[PDB]
Amino acid sequence: ARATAGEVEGSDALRMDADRAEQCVDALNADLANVYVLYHQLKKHHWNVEGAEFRDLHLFLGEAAETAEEVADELAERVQALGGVPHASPETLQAEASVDVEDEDVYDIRTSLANDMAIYGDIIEATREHTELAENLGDHATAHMLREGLIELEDDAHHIEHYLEDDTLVTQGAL
Amino acid sequence: STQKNARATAGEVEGSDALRMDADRAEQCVDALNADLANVYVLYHQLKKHHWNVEGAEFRDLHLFLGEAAETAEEVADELAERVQALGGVPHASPETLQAEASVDVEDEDVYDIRTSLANDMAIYGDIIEATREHTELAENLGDHATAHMLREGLIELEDDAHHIEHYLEDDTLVTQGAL
Amino acid sequence: ARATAGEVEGSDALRMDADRAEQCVDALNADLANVYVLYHQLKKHHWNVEGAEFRDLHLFLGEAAETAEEVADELAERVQALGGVPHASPETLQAEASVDVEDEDVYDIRTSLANDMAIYGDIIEATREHTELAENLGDHATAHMLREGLIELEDDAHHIEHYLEDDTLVTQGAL
Amino acid sequence: STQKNARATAGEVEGSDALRMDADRAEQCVDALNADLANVYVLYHQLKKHHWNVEGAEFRDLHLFLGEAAETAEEVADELAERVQALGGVPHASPETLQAEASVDVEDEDVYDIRTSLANDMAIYGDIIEATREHTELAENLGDHATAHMLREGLIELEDDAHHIEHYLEDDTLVTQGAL
Amino acid sequence: ARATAGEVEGSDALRMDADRAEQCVDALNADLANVYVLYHQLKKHHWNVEGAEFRDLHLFLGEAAETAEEVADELAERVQALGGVPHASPETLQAEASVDVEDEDVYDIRTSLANDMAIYGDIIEATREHTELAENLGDHATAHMLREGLIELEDDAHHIEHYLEDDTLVTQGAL
Amino acid sequence: ARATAGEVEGSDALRMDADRAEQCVDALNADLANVYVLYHQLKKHHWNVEGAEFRDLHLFLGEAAETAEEVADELAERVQALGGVPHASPETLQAEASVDVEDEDVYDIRTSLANDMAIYGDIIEATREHTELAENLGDHATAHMLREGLIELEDDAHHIEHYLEDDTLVTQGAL
Amino acid sequence: ARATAGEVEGSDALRMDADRAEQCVDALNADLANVYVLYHQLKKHHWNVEGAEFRDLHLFLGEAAETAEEVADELAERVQALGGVPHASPETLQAEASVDVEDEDVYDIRTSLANDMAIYGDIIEATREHTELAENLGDHATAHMLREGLIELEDDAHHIEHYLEDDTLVTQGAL
Amino acid sequence: STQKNARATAGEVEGSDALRMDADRAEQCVDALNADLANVYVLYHQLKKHHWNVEGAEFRDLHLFLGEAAETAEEVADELAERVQALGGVPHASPETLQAEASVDVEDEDVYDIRTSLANDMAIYGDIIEATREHTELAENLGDHATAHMLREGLIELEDDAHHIEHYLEDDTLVTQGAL
Amino acid sequence: ARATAGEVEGSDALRMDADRAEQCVDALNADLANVYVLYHQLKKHHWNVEGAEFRDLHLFLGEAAETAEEVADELAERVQALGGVPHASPETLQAEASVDVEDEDVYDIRTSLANDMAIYGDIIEATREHTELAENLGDHATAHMLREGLIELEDDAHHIEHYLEDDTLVTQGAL
Amino acid sequence: ARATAGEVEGSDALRMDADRAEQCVDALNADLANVYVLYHQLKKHHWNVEGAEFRDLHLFLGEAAETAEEVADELAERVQALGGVPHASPETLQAEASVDVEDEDVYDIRTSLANDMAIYGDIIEATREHTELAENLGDHATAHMLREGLIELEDDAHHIEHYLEDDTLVTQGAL
Amino acid sequence: ARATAGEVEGSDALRMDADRAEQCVDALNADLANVYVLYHQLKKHHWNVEGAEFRDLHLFLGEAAETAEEVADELAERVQALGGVPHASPETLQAEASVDVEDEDVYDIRTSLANDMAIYGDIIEATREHTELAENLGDHATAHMLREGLIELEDDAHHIEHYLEDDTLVTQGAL
Ligand SMILES: [Fe+3]
Ligand SMILES: [Fe+3]
Ligand SMILES: [Fe+3]
Ligand SMILES: [Fe+3]
Ligand SMILES: [Fe+3]
Ligand SMILES: [Fe+3]
Ligand SMILES: [Fe+3]
Ligand SMILES: [Fe+3]
Ligand SMILES: [Fe+3]
Ligand SMILES: [Fe+3]
Ligand SMILES: [Fe+3]
Ligand SMILES: [Fe+3]
Ligand SMILES: [Fe+3]
Ligand SMILES: [Fe+3]
Ligand SMILES: [Fe+3]
Ligand SMILES: [Fe+3]
Ligand SMILES: [Fe+3]
Ligand SMILES: [Fe+3]
Ligand SMILES: [Fe+3]
Ligand SMILES: [Fe+3]
Ligand SMILES: [Fe+3]
Ligand SMILES: [Fe+3]
Ligand SMILES: [Fe+3]
Ligand SMILES: [Fe+3]
Ligand SMILES: [Fe+3]
Ligand SMILES: [Fe+3]
Ligand SMILES: [Fe+3]
Ligand SMILES: [Fe+3]
Ligand SMILES: [Fe+3]
Ligand SMILES: [Fe+3]
Ligand SMILES: [Fe+3]
Ligand SMILES: [Fe+3]
Ligand SMILES: [Fe+3]
Ligand SMILES: [Fe+3]
Ligand SMILES: [Fe+3]
Ligand SMILES: [Fe+3]
Ligand SMILES: [Fe+3]
Ligand SMILES: [Fe+3]
Ligand SMILES: [Fe+3]
Ligand SMILES: [Fe+3]
Ligand SMILES: [Fe+3]
Ligand SMILES: [Fe+3]
Ligand SMILES: [Fe+3]
Ligand SMILES: [Fe+3]
Ligand SMILES: [Fe+3]
Ligand SMILES: [Fe+3]
Ligand SMILES: [Fe+3]
Ligand SMILES: [Fe+3]
Ligand SMILES: [Fe+3]
Ligand SMILES: [Fe+3]
Ligand SMILES: [Fe+3]
Ligand SMILES: [Fe+3]
Ligand SMILES: [Fe+3]
Ligand SMILES: [Fe+3]
Ligand SMILES: [Fe+3]
Ligand SMILES: [Fe+3]
Ligand SMILES: [Fe+3]
Ligand SMILES: [Fe+3]
Ligand SMILES: [Fe+3]
Ligand SMILES: [Fe+3]
Ligand SMILES: [Fe+3]
Ligand SMILES: [Fe+3]
Ligand SMILES: [Fe+3]
Ligand SMILES: [Fe+3]
Ligand SMILES: [Fe+3]
Ligand SMILES: [Fe+3]
Ligand SMILES: [Fe+3]
Ligand SMILES: [Fe+3]
Ligand SMILES: [Fe+3]
Ligand SMILES: [Fe+3]
Ligand SMILES: [Fe+3]
Ligand SMILES: [Fe+3]
Ligand SMILES: [Fe+3]
Ligand SMILES: [Fe+3]
Ligand SMILES: [Fe+3]
Ligand SMILES: [Fe+3]
Ligand SMILES: [Fe+3]
Ligand SMILES: [Fe+3]
Ligand SMILES: [Fe+3]
Ligand SMILES: [Fe+3]
Ligand SMILES: [Fe+3]
Ligand SMILES: [Fe+3]
Ligand SMILES: [Fe+3]
Ligand SMILES: [Fe+3]
Ligand code: NA
Ligand code: NA
Ligand code: NA
Ligand code: NA
């Protein structure tokens, strides 16, 4: 094997010592797992959503899934850049993830959306801390990246929050 | 023969020498295809109708969806009509002929709520979907792989639009009695 | 001061005398103010809208706001072309506007939308008259412009009207 | 509470559970942001004004520049307004409220030469630029990195437009007394 | 010869009788000549302009020339559509043109621009009348076209007018 | 729970009875799992690949990963269309997958590529059978889809096979 | 030499044994030759066509030539993928081609077009059989490819057939 | 000199210091180029004429072709005019001057069949093509490689449009006495 | 037969007499054949290349093949323009070609590339002479074309030369 | 002389006093020089690289050079904005640069790449400090810019580091 | 070292002997240096230009700088192609450049522009000779390239010449 899961040789090219590096690699790899299960959950809801606002949510969730995948790729590559070994197998990703994943059953859209909002929140708070950890460790590049992705994650979470709000054009009459 | 006016007569299927397709095999497809052309074209006009009329809370979402569905139907219809003409046949053309030759249920000129309308279109899709599955077999069997391939390509599209209508009708929503 | 608010020197290049000009400039400047408050109101609703049809309306209202801004730019520039001085400050724009603007509180989406439909209607009727005024004054260019913008304004108003209609996919069951 | 009309009241800041931002921290930002939203929006209208009126030899060059500057201001304003609403606040909306709440100097409805106008805008930019530098610190300190990041992103744009106006006003030119 | 310059057979396809037609064809062909000399003059100034605002005017005049050519094409094709024979040779075009063309000498930019503004004005006034003539003759298509082109011509004329205005960033100091 | 993992209600819209449907849904869902672990493995190699042909493989593996994701989306959506419930969680996906996934260690590029070629092969053979199963069950749509995706999968597998072939421009001299 | 013309090692990556493979490789390589002479003939007619419908045919034949080249590339690469060795030299291509190629003289357009229609027909019939051969050998990828190209070839042949039909806008009068 | 109105006088060629081209060498090119500018510009107007008038069975095909040809001529003309002005000369400008200075045959304002017209344009192309071949030599010889290069670049385009007209006039067609 | 291979009627439209013409047509037609066999050889290597730098060369050779085809089209059309008859059949093209074409066997990439470099060289030298022949015959258009194509051919030959140079990132260590 | 190298008048428009300004301008101008020599070195390697991975590195180094140029432009313009005078002549740039530039000889790709990695490292560390210096001086704009560019520089350095790693697809066998 | 500054091994691929080659490589390398200092000077003026026509010149000079960089890249790569070693370090480039570079002080725009016009002129004359040298040495490719770049350089120089001309829209009145 060229590398062993868990090891963090740092990077000479990036002038990042394995000491500072390991701190980020541990933070980043934690997020990679959470974002990737988020990815798979958003896909799930993307595939299953039904109802009156089905097509609108179908496209929204699709985009959200895509954003998650891009964010995940950014993390995984930043880890590998810092000399680490990013989580890879689906099994490892879920194991390492600290958020709540739904059992293989299919729930109504409000429940599902509500569950995703929950995953977003955890990832959003974990990420805010990691950017500080990065700015403090002097790793401005990683900090910058995290913010760039954070901005996207927060917009998707806020959208889910608006979908769940208590308003509508539907009137008891039209029912 | 050497004294007629029309270049071709509705119903006739001369086959094609270029495509190495004899009028015998050809006529079988041309009859299948022309049957579909009529159904898809009335489907086209119905989807347009609903496209123009849809109102309500999910109006804009459906307006765009139905528009796309109408477009797909028109493209599928064009593919059929041109495959017929390629096989030496004469594709149905006038609006009158198209509806007459169509075996699906078209709505009277009145305007119904969106669930009814959508439900009616799902019905038309189903008939076209089943008719098409058979026609592709008929084509693969007649050795006409090109026509078979085309039908599948279009079938895949038709099925996705029907499945979408099915999801619009499902019993779920973000709307809560509270928000009402 | 190169020009004074209220003055209309007309235009030699456009072969438009200050006499005919002032009639249009007064019509146009009246609309500019109405459209610009319309712009800010649409923005407001754009920012605040929440609920089940939130994202759909968010995008719609955004576009509507954009259209209003473009129409406003067209008016302001036609005014300045005809030798006039287009209203500019936010204060002047609201003052000069004859439509009803909402107080700084946030209302449900049906109320808001209903208020905008009201603003559209006034602008739509005012504009129909102004195009006649323009065709009559022989100013075909201004007339043409107004129609071009009118067509857009009417489509956005009609959309709001469809959002408010009494129909929906939502069923008492799904509730 | 369970008997009001408005969904929200100007001035109130409920914070955000989704963004894990408590109304305590939030209100500090929402007050900073809303202050800027007003300044940027009057800046927007002033830049438009100059965009519409500018005349002269460098007219077309400035016409395009000011147009872009106006656009940037509008985008920055949208970012602020939406960040406020995200943090549970209520962004200023009416033209009347925006000017009232704005702390910068707006020109009376008369039209001045381009150097005066430009000079006035440079003044508005400066105030917004200094106010913004402080607000980003306020945000980084309050632990709200997202809002901080946004402010910097917009700050970078605002500073480039202000610096351009500064170069337009500099004392140089290709024009020579001869050519006059 | 398939057709003779001066003849106007009208159009059966467009349901336009040679009687009504000839009235438009005479109006249109008059403009075609004016716009085409305008085209060549704008080109001339495009090629020759020099100075401090040279590149800015170079691009502007180029665009103006292009617009004129497009407007000319529209006229010529509308004429041919109405059964007429559009002026073609450079010689015929200038002869038939009623505007003032500069002798082959090169003048300063203010003089040139001033001359073009003059040509625009004549074309602008001639066109305003022709659209009425067209709407009255019931030929809405031709009327519509003329307005569409008129709008463009007026914007280019107004630009020239702003270039000539008495303002600048240049200060006696900087001189 | 709107649906239960394992259940296949078929589809009235698609005129597909739960009897025929379940046969496909079981075939498709089996593939979905294999393709999704393939996706994660290709990503892994995408992130880790190093060496002389690193950038070339980095881009290739990235595209391969993307194709796998698209194929997976097609499967999952065809399943849901046929009334089934597509596998979703990373945990479920790996569990349900019948191919060999690498432990979290990082191996040289030849080993990794060799392992992926292995996964492709199994998916390629399983897919060939499933298309027959589909054509036989009269489900031409699903059959067609499978072929469309099969064509892509085979090209990516064949590319990996060419990377592993025994040829190169490198000469003992240049070493 | 790395490979010998005629040999077909099959493909481990594509899980295709040299036994099944050779059957396709022989079919495909036969077509590659026919399509490539078709390519060169279409080019020839592309370069030489003259007359009233010259430009229309010039563009059409150009496109047809391009399609043929793309189809040829697809075949050649599928052959090489299946472990075979695609025909390459112009000499080998014509030798191996079973269709009728024109001697280096230039004929009228109807004759030429008529000759190409002949080449298309042979390629069209040969291809219909090869797709069956492929579906039967279980090689769905190759089958799919052939159909995709077949669809294009048939459209170009049908176009040539329409060019040769007995109709026209030309009237004895206009002559 | 220090009391004239025109910035330049038609006929004068001050050369160019920036381009290191003396009025002596320059005038030779400017005379060659300006001669072509006139021919190409009448060619432009003739191609437009035929573009507007062409009718018949191959009407749309020729309509587009002639339009493109007209466009190419205009671009070539612009290149010449600007190369002249670059070399210190004064390019012909008025429609009157352009035709006067042109040495090719322009049609009277009557409309002829397409074969005649096309035949006339082929004639204009030929003269411009031969004149241009010489001018490129004149330019390479005068050491003005830039002008030479330009002329070739344009020559290549002009020759392709002339050759197309030649193919339209060739004696072949798909039309058969039968179909007549 | 509208024309006979070998005949060169020149061109009245291009004011090129059959005397001068035949000299170019003989030069050009000689090149057309060489470039077209070059085209087929580059394709061959394009299809077969394998190894570590396989994908990089696959794309490079593909582009090279495309350039050759474009150059060939330019020649063939210039010949036909000058009243000649361009070589067309694959058989004729190879026969008329004076360069060395590989037998249908497949060689390692260094050998193949080395062979193409050889073909480029001959075409490059032949072309340099033909441009002089053209400038001398007063045919500047043909000369210009040849240079334009020559520039492209030389860049592709120089690229092959760099691929063969004795350098690499590969180290005995990494082996 | 409008300004003198070394002088820093600050900026009234940016509300930046010459006191604070000079601190940044000295930091930025130091970097501008380093990045610009980096630019020229990357170009050099871009032009000279040869070997098996030549084209891959040719494109990579080209992009890297481009990024460096953009970063340099950002610095130079930020300096000029802050009232300073950015280094300009090639002579001044190298003189003012604190990194190691290669003598005009050409070295193997590993040596060259290794040298650039060295330059990146110094620029990366210098930049990390300058962003702090900027955030501290209250100049958030300059700080933000530096991070944005830093992120890019680090990715290019990390790429060079991966090219130098000890792995490859090449096998002693293939040699 | 793989190569030594000053050496010119020519090129076997391009069939260019080191004898002929060295003549071009010496001409080209001389230009590369002049164009690259031109690049840096245009950048300088790009960054510093202020005044009324500031933005217009800012964009113009930016484009000019870009053109210079592209021309420089073309030279450097042609040199390396011909077996030479292109100048690389900023220090070497200025040293080898024969044109006048401004000291690090900032001058008014007319002075600066005037200085650049001077650099253009020298490069323009040097280039005209080098193309002849190339056509004569039989190196048509290099000759062609030089002309292509020459055409661009001359247009940028001519633009600077128009900026400096004695004309303007500014009037003593407006002052
Ligand atoms: Fe994705
Ligand atoms: Fe994706
Ligand atoms: Fe990636
Ligand atoms: Fe990235
Ligand atoms: Fe690494
Ligand atoms: Fe970003
Ligand atoms: Fe509607
Ligand atoms: Fe359509
Ligand atoms: Fe369509
Ligand atoms: Fe069609
Ligand atoms: Fe079709
Ligand atoms: Fe037919
Ligand atoms: Fe398809
Ligand atoms: Fe919102
Ligand atoms: Fe907007
Ligand atoms: Fe505007
Ligand atoms: Fe406008
Ligand atoms: Fe004005
Ligand atoms: Fe419009
Ligand atoms: Fe304006
Ligand atoms: Fe906008
Ligand atoms: Fe906007
Ligand atoms: Fe917005
Ligand atoms: Fe936003
Ligand atoms: Fe909210
Ligand atoms: Fe950004
Ligand atoms: Fe000029
Ligand atoms: Fe034009
Ligand atoms: Fe036209
Ligand atoms: Fe038109
Ligand atoms: Fe007509
Ligand atoms: Fe229009
Ligand atoms: Fe249910
Ligand atoms: Fe990587
Ligand atoms: Fe993806
Ligand atoms: Fe999907
Ligand atoms: Fe899908
Ligand atoms: Fe679904
Ligand atoms: Fe989908
Ligand atoms: Fe479903
Ligand atoms: Fe497909
Ligand atoms: Fe397909
Ligand atoms: Fe092997
Ligand atoms: Fe091609
Ligand atoms: Fe091609
Ligand atoms: Fe290929
Ligand atoms: Fe392919
Ligand atoms: Fe192989
Ligand atoms: Fe396809
Ligand atoms: Fe016409
Ligand atoms: Fe044009
Ligand atoms: Fe043009
Ligand atoms: Fe021009
Ligand atoms: Fe030009
Ligand atoms: Fe001049
Ligand atoms: Fe060119
Ligand atoms: Fe003949
Ligand atoms: Fe291959
Ligand atoms: Fe090609
Ligand atoms: Fe061609
Ligand atoms: Fe060509
Ligand atoms: Fe030809
Ligand atoms: Fe061609
Ligand atoms: Fe010919
Ligand atoms: Fe070219
Ligand atoms: Fe060229
Ligand atoms: Fe060597
Ligand atoms: Fe000063
Ligand atoms: Fe190179
Ligand atoms: Fe660059
Ligand atoms: Fe810049
Ligand atoms: Fe910048
Ligand atoms: Fe600056
Ligand atoms: Fe810039
Ligand atoms: Fe400054
Ligand atoms: Fe950015
Ligand atoms: Fe950013
Ligand atoms: Fe290592
Ligand atoms: Fe650049
Ligand atoms: Fe660049
Ligand atoms: Fe390069
Ligand atoms: Fe190049
Ligand atoms: Fe080399
Ligand atoms: Fe070129
Ligand atoms: Na709803
Ligand atoms: Na390698
Ligand atoms: Na015809
Ligand atoms: Na000025």
From Swiss-Prot, chains A, C, E, F, G, I, J, K:
Pfam families documented for this protein: Ferritin
One GO CC annotation: cytoplasm
Binding of Fe cation 2, residues: E77
PTM: The N-terminus is blocked.
Reactions listed under catalytic activity: 2 Fe(2+) + H2O2 + 2 H(+) = 2 Fe(3+) + 2 H2O
Site (Involved in iron nucleation): E69, E148
E.C. number: 1.16.-.-
Name of this protein: DNA protection during starvation protein
Top-level taxon: Archaea
Keyword flag Oxidoreductase: yes
Localization (cell): Cytoplasm
Extra information: The dps dodecamer comprises iron-binding sites for iron translocation, oxidation and nucleation. Fe(2+) atoms are initially bound to the outer surface in proximity to the iron entry pore from which they are translocated toward the inter-subunit ferroxidase centers via two discrete steps. Iron oxidation proceeds by transient formation of tri-iron ferroxidase centers and Fe(3+) atoms move to two distinct iron nucleation centers where iron mineralization occurs.
Site (Involved in iron translocation): W47, E50, V79, Q80, H158, H162, E165
GO MF entry, a single one: ferric iron binding
Task of the protein: Protects DNA from oxidative damage by sequestering intracellular Fe(2+) ion and storing it in the form of Fe(3+) oxyhydroxide mineral. One hydrogen peroxide oxidizes two Fe(2+) ions, which prevents hydroxyl radical production by the Fenton reaction.
From Swiss-Prot, chains B, D, H:
Catalysed conversion reaction: 2 Fe(2+) + H2O2 + 2 H(+) = 2 Fe(3+) + 2 H2O
Molecular function via GO: ferric iron binding; oxidoreductase activity
Residues with site note (Involved in iron translocation): W52, E55, V84, Q85, H163, H167, E170
Keywords: Cytoplasm, Iron, Iron storage, Metal-binding, Oxidoreductase
Disulfide partners: none
Marked site positions, Involved in iron nucleation: E74, E153
Family, per entry: Belongs to the Dps family.
Quaternary organization: Homododecamer. The 12 subunits form a hollow sphere into which the mineral iron core of up to 110 Fe(3+) can be deposited.
Note: The dps dodecamer comprises iron-binding sites for iron translocation, oxidation and nucleation. Fe(2+) atoms are initially bound to the outer surface in proximity to the iron entry pore from which they are translocated toward the inter-subunit ferroxidase centers via two discrete steps. Iron oxidation proceeds by transient formation of tri-iron ferroxidase centers and Fe(3+) atoms move to two distinct iron nucleation centers where iron mineralization occurs.
Protein name, per record: DNA protection during starvation protein
Species of the source: Halobacterium salinarum (strain ATCC 700922 / JCM 11081 / NRC-1)
Gene encoding the protein: dps
